[PDB]
PDB file of C-alpha atoms and ligand atoms in Angstrom:
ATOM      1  CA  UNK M   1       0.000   0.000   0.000  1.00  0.00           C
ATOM      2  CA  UNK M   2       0.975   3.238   0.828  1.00  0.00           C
ATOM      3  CA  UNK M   3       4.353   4.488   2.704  1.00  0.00           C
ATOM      4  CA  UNK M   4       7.110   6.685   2.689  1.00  0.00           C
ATOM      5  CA  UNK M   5       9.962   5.272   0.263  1.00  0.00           C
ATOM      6  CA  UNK M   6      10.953   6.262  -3.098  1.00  0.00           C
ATOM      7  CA  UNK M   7       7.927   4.407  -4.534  1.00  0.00           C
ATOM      8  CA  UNK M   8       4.941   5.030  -2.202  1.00  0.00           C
ATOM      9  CA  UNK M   9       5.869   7.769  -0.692  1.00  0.00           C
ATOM     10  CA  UNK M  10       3.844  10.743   0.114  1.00  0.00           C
ATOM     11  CA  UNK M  11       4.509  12.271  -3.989  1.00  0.00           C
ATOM     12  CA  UNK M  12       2.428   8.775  -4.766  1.00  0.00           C
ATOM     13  CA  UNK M  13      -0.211   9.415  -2.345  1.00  0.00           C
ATOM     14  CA  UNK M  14      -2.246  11.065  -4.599  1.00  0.00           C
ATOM     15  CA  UNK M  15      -2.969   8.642  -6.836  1.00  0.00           C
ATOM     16  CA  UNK M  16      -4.952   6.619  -4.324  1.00  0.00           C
ATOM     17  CA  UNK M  17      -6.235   9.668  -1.899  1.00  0.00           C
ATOM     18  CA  UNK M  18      -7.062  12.713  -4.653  1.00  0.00           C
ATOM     19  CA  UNK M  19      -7.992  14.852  -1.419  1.00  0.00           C
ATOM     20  CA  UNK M  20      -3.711  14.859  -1.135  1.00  0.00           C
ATOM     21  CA  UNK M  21      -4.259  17.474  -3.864  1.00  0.00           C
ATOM     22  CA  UNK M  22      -6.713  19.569  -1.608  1.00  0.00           C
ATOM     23  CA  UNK M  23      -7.362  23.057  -0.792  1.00  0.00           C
ATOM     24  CA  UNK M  24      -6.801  22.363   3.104  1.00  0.00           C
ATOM     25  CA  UNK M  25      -4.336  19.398   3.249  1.00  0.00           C
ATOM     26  CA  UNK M  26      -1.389  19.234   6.076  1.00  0.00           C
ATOM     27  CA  UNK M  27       1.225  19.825   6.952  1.00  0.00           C
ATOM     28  CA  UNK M  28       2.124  23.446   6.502  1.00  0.00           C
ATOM     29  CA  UNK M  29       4.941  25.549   6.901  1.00  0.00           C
ATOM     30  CA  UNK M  30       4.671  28.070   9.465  1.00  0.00           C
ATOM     31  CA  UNK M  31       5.621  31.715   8.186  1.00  0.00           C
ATOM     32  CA  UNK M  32       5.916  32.914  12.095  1.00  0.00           C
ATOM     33  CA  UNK M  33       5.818  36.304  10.481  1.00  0.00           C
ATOM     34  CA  UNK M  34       2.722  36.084   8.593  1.00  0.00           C
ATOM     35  CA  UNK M  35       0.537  34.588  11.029  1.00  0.00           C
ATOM     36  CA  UNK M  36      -1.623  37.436  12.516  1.00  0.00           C
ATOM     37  CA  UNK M  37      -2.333  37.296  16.614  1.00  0.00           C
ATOM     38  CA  UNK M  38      -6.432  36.906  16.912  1.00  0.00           C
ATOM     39  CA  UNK M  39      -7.806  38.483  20.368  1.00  0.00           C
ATOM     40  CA  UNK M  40     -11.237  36.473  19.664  1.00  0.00           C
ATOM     41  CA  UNK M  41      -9.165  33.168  20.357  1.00  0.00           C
ATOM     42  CA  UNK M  42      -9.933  31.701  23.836  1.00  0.00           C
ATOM     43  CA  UNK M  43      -7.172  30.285  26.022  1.00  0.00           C
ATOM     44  CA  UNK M  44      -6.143  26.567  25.709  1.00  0.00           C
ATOM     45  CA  UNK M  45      -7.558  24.042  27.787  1.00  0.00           C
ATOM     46  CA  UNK M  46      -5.741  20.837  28.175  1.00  0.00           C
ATOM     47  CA  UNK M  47      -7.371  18.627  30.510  1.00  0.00           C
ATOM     48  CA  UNK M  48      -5.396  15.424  30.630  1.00  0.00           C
ATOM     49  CA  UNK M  49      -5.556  14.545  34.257  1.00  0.00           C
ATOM     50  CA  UNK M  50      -8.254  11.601  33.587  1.00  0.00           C
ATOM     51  CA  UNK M  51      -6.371  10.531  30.863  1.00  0.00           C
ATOM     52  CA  UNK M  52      -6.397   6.518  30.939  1.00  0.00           C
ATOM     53  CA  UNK M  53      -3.663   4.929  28.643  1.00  0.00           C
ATOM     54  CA  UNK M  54      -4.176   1.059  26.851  1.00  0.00           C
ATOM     55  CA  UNK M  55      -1.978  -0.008  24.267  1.00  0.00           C
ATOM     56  CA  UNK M  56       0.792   1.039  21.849  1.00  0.00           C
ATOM     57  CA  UNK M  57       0.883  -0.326  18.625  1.00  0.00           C
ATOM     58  CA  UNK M  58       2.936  -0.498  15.726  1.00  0.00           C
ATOM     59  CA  UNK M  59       0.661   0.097  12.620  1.00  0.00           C
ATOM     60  CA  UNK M  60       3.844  -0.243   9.963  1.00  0.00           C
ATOM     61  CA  UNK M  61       3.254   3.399   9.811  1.00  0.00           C
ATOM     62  CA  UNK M  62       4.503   5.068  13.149  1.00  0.00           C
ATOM     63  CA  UNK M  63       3.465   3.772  16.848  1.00  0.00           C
ATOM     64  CA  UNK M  64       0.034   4.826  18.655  1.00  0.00           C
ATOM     65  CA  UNK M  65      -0.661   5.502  22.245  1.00  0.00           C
ATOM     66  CA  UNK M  66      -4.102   4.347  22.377  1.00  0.00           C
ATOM     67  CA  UNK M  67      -6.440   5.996  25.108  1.00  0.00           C
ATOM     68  CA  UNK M  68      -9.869   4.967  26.141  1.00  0.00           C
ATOM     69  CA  UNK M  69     -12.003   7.491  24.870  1.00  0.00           C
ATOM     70  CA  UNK M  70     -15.378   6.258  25.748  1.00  0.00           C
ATOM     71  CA  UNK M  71     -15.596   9.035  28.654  1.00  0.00           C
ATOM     72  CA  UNK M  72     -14.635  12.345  29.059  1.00  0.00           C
ATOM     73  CA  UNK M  73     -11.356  11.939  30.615  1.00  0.00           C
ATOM     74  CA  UNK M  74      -8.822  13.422  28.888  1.00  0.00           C
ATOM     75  CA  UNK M  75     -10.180  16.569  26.986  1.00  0.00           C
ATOM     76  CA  UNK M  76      -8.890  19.594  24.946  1.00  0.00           C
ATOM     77  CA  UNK M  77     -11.457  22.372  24.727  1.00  0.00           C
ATOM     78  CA  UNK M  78     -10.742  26.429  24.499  1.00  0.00           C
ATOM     79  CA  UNK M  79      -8.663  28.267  21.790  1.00  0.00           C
ATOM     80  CA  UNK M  80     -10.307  27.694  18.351  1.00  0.00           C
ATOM     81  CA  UNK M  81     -12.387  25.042  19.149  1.00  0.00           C
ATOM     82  CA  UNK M  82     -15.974  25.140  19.709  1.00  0.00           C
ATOM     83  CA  UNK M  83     -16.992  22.261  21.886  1.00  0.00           C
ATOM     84  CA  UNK M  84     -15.328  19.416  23.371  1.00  0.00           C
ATOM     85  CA  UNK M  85     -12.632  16.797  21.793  1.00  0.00           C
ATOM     86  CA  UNK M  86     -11.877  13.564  23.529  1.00  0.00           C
ATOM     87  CA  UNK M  87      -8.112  12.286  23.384  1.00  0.00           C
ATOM     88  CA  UNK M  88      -7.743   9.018  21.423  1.00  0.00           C
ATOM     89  CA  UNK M  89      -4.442   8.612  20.598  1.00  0.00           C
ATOM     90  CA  UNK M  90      -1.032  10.286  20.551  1.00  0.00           C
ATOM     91  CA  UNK M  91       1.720   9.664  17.597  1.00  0.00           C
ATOM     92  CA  UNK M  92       5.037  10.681  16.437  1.00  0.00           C
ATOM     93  CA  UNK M  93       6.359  11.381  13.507  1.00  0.00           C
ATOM     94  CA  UNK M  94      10.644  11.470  13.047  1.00  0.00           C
ATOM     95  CA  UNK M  95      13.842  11.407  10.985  1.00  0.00           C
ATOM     96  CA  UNK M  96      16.667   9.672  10.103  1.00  0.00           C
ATOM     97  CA  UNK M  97      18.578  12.453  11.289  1.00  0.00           C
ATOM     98  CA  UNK M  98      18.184  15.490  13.922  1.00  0.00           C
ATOM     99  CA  UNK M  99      17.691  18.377  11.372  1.00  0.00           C
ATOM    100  CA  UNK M 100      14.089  16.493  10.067  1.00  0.00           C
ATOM    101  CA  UNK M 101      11.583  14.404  11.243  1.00  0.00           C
ATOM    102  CA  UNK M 102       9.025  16.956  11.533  1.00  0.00           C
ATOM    103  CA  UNK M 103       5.617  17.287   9.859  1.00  0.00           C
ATOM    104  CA  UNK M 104       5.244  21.223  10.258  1.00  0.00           C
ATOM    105  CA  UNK M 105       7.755  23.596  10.004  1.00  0.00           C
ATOM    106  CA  UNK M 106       8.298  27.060  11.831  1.00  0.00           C
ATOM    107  CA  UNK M 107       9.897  29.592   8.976  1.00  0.00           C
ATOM    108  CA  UNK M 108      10.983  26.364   6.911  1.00  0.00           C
ATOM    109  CA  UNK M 109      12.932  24.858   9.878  1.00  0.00           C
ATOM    110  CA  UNK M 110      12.243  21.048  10.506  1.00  0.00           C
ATOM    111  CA  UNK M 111      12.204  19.661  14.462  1.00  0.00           C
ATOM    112  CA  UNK M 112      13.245  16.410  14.922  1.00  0.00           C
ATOM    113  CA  UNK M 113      10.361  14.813  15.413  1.00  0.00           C
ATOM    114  CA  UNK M 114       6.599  15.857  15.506  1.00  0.00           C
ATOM    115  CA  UNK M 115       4.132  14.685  18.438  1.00  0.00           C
ATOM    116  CA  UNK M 116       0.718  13.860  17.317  1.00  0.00           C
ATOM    117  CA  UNK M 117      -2.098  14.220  20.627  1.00  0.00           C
ATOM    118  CA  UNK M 118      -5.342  13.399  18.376  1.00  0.00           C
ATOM    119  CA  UNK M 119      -8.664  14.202  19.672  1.00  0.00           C
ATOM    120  CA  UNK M 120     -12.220  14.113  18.324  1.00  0.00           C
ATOM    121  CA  UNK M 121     -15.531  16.201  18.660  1.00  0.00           C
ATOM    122  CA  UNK M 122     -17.836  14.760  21.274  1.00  0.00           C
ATOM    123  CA  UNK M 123     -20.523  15.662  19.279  1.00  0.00           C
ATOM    124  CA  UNK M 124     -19.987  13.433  16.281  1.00  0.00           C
ATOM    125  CA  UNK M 125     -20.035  10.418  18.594  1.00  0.00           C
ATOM    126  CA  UNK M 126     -16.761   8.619  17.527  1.00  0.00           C
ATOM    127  CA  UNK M 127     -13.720   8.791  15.938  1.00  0.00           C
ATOM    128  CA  UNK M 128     -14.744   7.148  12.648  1.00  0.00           C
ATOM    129  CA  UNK M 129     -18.006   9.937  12.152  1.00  0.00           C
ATOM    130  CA  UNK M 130     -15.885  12.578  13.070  1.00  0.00           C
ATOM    131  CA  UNK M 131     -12.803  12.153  10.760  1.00  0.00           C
ATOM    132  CA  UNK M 132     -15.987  12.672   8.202  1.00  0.00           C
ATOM    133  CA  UNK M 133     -16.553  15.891   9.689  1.00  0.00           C
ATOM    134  CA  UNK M 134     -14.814  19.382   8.548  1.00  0.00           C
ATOM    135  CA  UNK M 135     -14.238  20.038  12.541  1.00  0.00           C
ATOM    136  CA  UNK M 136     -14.498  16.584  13.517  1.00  0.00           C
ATOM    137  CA  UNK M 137     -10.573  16.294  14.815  1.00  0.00           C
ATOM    138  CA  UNK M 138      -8.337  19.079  16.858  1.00  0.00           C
ATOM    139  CA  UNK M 139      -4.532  17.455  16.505  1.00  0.00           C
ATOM    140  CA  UNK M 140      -2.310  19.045  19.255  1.00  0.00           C
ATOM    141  CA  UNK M 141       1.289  19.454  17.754  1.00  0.00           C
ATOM    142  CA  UNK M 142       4.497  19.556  19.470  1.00  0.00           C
ATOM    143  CA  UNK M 143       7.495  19.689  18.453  1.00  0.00           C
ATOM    144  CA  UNK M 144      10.537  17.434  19.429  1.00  0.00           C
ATOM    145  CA  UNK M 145      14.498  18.547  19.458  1.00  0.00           C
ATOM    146  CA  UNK M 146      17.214  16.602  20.638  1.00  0.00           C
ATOM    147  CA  UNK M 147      19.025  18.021  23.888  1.00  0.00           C
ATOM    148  CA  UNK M 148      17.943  17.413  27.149  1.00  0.00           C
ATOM    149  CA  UNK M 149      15.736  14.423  28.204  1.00  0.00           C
ATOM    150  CA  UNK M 150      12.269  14.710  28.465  1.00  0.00           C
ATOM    151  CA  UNK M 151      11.403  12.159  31.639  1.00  0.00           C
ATOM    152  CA  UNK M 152       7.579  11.657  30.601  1.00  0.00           C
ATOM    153  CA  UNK M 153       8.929  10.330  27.299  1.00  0.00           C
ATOM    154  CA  UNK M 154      11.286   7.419  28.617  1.00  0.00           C
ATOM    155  CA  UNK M 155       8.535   5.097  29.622  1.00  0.00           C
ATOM    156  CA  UNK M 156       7.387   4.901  25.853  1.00  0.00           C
ATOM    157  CA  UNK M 157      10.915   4.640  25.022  1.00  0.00           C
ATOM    158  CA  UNK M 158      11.923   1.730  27.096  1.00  0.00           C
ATOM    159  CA  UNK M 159       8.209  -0.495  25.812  1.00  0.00           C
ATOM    160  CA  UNK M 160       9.240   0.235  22.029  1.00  0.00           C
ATOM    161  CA  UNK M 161      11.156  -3.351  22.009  1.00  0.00           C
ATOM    162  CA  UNK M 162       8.023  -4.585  22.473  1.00  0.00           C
ATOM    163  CA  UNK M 163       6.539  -3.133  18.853  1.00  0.00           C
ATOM    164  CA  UNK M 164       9.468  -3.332  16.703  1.00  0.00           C
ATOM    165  CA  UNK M 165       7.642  -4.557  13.909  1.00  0.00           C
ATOM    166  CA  UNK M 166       4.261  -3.672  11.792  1.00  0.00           C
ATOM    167  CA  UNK M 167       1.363  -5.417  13.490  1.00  0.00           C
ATOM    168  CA  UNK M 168       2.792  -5.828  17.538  1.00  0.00           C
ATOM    169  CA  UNK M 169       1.236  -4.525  19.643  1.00  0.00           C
ATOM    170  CA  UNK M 170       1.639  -3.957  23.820  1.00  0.00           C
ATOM    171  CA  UNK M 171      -0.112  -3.238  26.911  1.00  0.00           C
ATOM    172  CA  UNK M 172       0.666   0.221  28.262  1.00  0.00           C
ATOM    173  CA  UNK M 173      -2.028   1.338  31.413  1.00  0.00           C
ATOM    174  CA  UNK M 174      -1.113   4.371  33.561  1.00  0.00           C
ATOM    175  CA  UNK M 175       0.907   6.434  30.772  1.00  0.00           C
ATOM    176  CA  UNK M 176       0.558  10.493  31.614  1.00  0.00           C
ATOM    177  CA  UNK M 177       0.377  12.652  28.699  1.00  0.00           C
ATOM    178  CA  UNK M 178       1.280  15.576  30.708  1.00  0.00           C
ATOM    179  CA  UNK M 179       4.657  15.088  30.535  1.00  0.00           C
ATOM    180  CA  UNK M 180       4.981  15.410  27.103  1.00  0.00           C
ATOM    181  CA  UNK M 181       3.808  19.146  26.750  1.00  0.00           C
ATOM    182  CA  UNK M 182       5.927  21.896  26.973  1.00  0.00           C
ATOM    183  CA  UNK M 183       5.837  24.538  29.281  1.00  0.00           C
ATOM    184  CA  UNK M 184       3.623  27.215  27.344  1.00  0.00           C
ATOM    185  CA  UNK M 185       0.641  26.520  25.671  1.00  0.00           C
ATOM    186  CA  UNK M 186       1.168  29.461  23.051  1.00  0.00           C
ATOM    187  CA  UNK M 187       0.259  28.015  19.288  1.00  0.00           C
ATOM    188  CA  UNK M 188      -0.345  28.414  15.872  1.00  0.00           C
ATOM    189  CA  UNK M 189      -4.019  27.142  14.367  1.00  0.00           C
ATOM    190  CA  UNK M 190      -4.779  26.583  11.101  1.00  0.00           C
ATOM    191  CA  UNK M 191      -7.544  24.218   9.477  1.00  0.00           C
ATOM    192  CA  UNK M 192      -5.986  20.972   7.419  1.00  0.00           C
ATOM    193  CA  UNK M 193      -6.198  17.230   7.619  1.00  0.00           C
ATOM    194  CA  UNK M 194      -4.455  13.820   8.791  1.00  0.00           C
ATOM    195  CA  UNK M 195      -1.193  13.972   7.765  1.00  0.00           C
ATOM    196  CA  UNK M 196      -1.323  10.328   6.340  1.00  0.00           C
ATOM    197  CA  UNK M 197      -4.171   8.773   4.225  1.00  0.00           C
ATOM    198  CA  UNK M 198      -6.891   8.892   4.109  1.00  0.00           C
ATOM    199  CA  UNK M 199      -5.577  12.513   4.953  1.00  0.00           C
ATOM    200  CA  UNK M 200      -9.416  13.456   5.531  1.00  0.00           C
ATOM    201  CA  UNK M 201      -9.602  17.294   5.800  1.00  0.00           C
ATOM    202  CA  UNK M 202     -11.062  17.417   9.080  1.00  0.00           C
ATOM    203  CA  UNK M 203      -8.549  18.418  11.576  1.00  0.00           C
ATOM    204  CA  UNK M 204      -8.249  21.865  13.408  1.00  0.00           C
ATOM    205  CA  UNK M 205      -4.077  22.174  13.679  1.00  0.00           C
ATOM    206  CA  UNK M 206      -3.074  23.571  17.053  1.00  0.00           C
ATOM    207  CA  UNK M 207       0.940  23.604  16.601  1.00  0.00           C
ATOM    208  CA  UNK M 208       2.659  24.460  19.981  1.00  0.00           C
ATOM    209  CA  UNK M 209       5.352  27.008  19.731  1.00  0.00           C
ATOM    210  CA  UNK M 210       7.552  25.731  22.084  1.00  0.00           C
ATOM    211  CA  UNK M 211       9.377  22.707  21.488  1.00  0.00           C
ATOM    212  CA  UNK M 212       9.697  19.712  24.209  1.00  0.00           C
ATOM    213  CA  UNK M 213      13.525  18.748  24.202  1.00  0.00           C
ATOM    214  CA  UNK M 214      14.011  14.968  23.834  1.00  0.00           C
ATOM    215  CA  UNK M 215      18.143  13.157  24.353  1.00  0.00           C
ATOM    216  CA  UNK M 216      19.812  12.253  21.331  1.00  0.00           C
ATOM    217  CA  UNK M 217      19.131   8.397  22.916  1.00  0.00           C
ATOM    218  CA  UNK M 218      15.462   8.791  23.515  1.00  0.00           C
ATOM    219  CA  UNK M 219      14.983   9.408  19.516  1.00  0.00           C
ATOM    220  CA  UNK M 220      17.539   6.751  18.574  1.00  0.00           C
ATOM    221  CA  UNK M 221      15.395   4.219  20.128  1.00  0.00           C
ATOM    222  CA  UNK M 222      12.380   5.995  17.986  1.00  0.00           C
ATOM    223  CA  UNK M 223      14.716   4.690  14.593  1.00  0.00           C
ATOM    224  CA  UNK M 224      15.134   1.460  15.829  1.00  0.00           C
ATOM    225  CA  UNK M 225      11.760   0.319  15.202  1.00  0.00           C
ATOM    226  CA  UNK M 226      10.393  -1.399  11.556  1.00  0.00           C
ATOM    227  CA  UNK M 227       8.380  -0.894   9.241  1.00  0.00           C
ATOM    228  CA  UNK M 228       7.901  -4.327   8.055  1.00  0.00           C
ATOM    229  CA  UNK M 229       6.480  -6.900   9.789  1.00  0.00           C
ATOM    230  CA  UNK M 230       8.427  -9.278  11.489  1.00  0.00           C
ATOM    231  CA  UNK M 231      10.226 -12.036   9.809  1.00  0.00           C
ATOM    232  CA  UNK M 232      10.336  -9.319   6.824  1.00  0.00           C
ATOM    233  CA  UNK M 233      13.353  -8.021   5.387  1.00  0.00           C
ATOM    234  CA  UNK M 234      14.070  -5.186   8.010  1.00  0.00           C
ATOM    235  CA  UNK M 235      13.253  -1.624   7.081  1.00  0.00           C
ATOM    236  CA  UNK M 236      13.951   0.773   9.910  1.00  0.00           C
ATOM    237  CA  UNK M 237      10.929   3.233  10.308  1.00  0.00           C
ATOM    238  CA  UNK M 238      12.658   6.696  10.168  1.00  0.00           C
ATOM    239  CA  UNK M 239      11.427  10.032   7.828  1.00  0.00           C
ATOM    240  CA  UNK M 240       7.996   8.910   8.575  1.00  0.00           C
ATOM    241  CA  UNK M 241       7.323  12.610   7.414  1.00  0.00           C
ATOM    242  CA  UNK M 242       5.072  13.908   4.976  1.00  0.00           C
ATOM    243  CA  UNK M 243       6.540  17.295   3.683  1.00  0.00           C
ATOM    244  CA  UNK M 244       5.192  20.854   3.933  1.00  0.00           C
ATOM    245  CA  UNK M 245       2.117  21.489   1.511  1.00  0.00           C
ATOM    246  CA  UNK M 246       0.830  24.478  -0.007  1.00  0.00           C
ATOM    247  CA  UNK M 247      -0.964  26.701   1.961  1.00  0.00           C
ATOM    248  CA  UNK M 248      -3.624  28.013  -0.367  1.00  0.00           C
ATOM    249  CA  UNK M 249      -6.838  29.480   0.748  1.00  0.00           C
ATOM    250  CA  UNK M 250      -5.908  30.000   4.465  1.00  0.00           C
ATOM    251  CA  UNK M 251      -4.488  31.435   6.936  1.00  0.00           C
ATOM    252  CA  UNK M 252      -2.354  30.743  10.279  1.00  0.00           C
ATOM    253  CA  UNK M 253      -3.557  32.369  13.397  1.00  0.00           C
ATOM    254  CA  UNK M 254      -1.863  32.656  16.686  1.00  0.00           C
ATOM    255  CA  UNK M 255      -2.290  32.751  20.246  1.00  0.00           C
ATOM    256  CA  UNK M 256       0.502  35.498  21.542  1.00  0.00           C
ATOM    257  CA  UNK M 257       2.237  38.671  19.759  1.00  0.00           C
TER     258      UNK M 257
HETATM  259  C1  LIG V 301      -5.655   7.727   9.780  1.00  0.00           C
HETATM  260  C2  LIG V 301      -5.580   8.284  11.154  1.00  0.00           C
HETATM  261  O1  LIG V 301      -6.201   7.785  12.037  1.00  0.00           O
HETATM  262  C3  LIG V 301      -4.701   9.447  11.423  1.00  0.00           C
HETATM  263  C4  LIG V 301      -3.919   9.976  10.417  1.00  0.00           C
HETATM  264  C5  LIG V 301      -3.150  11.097  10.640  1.00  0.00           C
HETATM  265  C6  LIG V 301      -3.144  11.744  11.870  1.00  0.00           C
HETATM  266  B1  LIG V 301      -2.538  13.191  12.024  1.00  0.00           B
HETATM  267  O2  LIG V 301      -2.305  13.974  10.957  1.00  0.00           O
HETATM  268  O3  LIG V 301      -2.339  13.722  13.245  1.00  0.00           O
HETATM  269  C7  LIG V 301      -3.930  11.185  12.876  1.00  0.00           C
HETATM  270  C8  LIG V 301      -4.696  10.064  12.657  1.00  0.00           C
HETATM  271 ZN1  LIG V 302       0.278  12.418  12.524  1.00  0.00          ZN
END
């Protein structure tokens, strides 16, 4: 099917998925200059103390935190977004190297890696109706550089040679987003879609600007996983990226000045 090599990568993606040709599509560069500072936007709320952790899985694409979204437990409301989204799962997205990784970029520069927290409007009733939706997901993204360690981060790094290949999949209870956001909850928002395919145009983009700082180890452990399936020939899952796309018909607000 689809991936991220020379031959299904994302510049073949829309041959299956048209939409990857769309007036909204994701990610986008950030022109931190551009974006305009709108009063009218409320202040973030990122309620993730409820937040109940079940599995991790790798899907031959990256590896999901899965959450148990059946309650409100771990919510992100405020800013943009008009109503409430429930937290289902939480991705990453890296390189092979430091200088990329990154779905989003800030002035053209590329992070390391990309954190995915992916929530959906309570209102549409699941995950699958609201991906169907033009505001049916909010995507929190945060940005990962290598430096210092980030703590909250190690327990997902030490389970990952449980999920080396496409298809495992491991229990993972009692996992606390919280320590995976950075201090300040200043951001950019823009609307777009999934990164991947179906890459549905129903996400509302809410792009951190500070950075969480992840060890040069933590990340290395991030390109030891596969992309194949096990007893495969080994591919090792790294630029997992799909590039900047055009920005067209929008425009990137922000939360500060
Ligand atoms: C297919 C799917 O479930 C999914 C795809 C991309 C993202 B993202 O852009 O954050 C999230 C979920
Ligand atoms: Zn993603």
């Amino acid at each position: 099917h689809w991936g991220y090599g020379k031959h299904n990568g994302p510049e073949h993606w829309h041959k299956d998925f048209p939409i990857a040709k769309g007036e909204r599509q994701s990610p986008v560069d950030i022109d931190t200059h551009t974006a305009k500072y709108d009063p009218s936007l409320k202040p973030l709320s990122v309620s993730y103390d409820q937040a109940t952790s079940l599995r991790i899985l790798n899907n031959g694409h990256a590896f999901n935190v899965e959450f148990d979204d059946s309650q409100d437990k771990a919510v992100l409301k405020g800013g943009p977004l008009d109503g409430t989204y429930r937290l289902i799962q939480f991705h990453f997205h890296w390189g092979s190297l430091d200088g990329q990784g990154s779905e989003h970029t800030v002035d053209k520069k590329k992070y390391a890696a990309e954190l995915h927290l992916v929530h959906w409007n309570t209102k549409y009733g699941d995950f699958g109706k609201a991906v169907q939706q033009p505001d049916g997901l909010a995507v929190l993204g945060i940005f990962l550089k290598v430096g210092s360690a980030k703590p909250g981060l190690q327990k997902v790094v030490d389970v990952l040679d449980s999920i080396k290949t496409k298809g495992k999949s491991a229990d993972f209870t009692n996992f606390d987003p919280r320590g995976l956001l950075p201090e300040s909850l200043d951001y950019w928002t823009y609307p777009g879609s999934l990164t991947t395919p179906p890459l549905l145009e129903c996400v509302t983009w809410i792009v951190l600007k500070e950075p969480i700082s992840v060890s040069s180890e933590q990340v290395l452990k991030f390109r030891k996983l596969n992309f194949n399936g096990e007893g495969e020939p080994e591919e090792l899952m790294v630029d997992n990226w799909r590039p900047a796309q055009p920005l067209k018909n929008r425009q990137i607000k922000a939360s500060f000045k």
